[PDB]
Amino acid sequence: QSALTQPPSASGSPGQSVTISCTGTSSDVGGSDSVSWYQQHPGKAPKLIIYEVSQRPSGVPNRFSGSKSGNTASLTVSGLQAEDDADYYCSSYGGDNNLFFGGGTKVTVLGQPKAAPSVTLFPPSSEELQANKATLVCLISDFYPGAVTVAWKADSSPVKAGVETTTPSKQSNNKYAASSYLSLTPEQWKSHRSYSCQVTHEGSTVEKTVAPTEC
């Protein structure tokens, strides 16, 4: 899904430092010194802030520093300011002159206390089952920062199709909410023994499970 592997999210308080990694393979990150980093504020055009692992373009403050160790490049942002809040991407040229990209890391300069998400997993409703639909819904609410990743598990294996997750939105309590729904057929829901929703936030994971109970 993402050639280079970046953490989905990172965070720190104003004035602190935060380090985000960009892990590849021997033929890209560790094989050359062409790792770049890009910063994109929400709704803005991206900006190159690091090239050739460590070089800072003109106008990029020294608070941003890049390095590499093996197959993993790292960007460090010291003296975090609210302006540094943005999405950070890495890229690296490969062996056959192909450019590879990381998935991005959402960096949040905490503007309020951190809050873990409340998760509720709902099994199929009777009405939708009689309409040949067995959609599960994983409700996620009351979390901050608003970065979250969701993973569904049929029995114990990961599902890689039919998952949808809404963009997190601020609610009345100034915390974020979102929902992930898995569009299962009534057969899929009955054939397997249980489905699970896995939610990851600020590095920690929570998992709820549901199973057919003949109702």
Ligand X SMILES: CC[C@]1(c2ccccc2)CCN(c2cc(C)n(C)c(=O)c2)C1
Binding site for a copy of itself (CB under 8 A): 2, 36, 42-48, 51-52, 55, 57-58, 89, 96-99, 101-104, 120-123, 125-128, 133, 135, 137, 139, 141, 164, 166-169, 171-172, 177-179, 181, 208, 210, 213-215
Say whether 203 sits in a helix, a strand or coil. coil
Do residues 148 and 101 touch, judged by C-beta distance below 8 A?
no
- 214's CB contacts (< 8 A; 6+ apart) are none
Q: Determine contact, residues 66/54, Cβ cutoff 8 Å.
A: yes
Joined tokens for residue 122: 């709902």
Q: 42 is in the binding site of which of ligand X, a copy of itself, none (Cβ under 5 to 8 A by kind)?
A: a copy of itself
Q: Return the closest-CA partner of residue 40 out of 107, 112, 100, 93.
A: 107
Report d(CA 193, CA 190) in Å as an integer: 7
Please state the φ and ψ torsions of residue 142, each to the nearest 5 degrees.
Answer: 65, 45
Supply 145's token pair.
């920062």
Look at residue 166 and give the partner it binds from a copy of itself, ligand X, none, a contact being a CB closer than 5 to 8 Å depending on partner kind: a copy of itself
CB-wise, 43 or 113, nearer to ligand X?
43
Comparing CB distances to ligand X, the nearer of 15 and 46 is: 46
The nearer residue to a copy of itself, 126 or 156, going by C-beta atoms, is 126
19 neighbors 57 (Cβ within 8 angstroms): no
Q: How far is the CB of 92 from ligand X (least distance, A)?
A: 11
| Chain centroid, CA 141 distance in Å | 16
Out of 8, 27, 32, 47, name the contact with ligand X by CB under 6 A.
47
Segment interacting with ligand X, rule: CB under 6 A, options 7-15, 43-51, 66-74, 183-191: 43-51
The 84-103 contact track toward ligand X, x by CB under 6 A, reads: -----x-----------x-x
Binding status of residue 48 toward ligand X by CB under 6 A: yes
At residue 24, φ and ψ (nearest 5 deg) are -125, -140
Say how many residues touch ligand X, by CB under 6 A: 10
- Residues at the contact surface with ligand X, assessed by CB under 6 A: 2, 38, 40, 45-48, 89, 101, 103
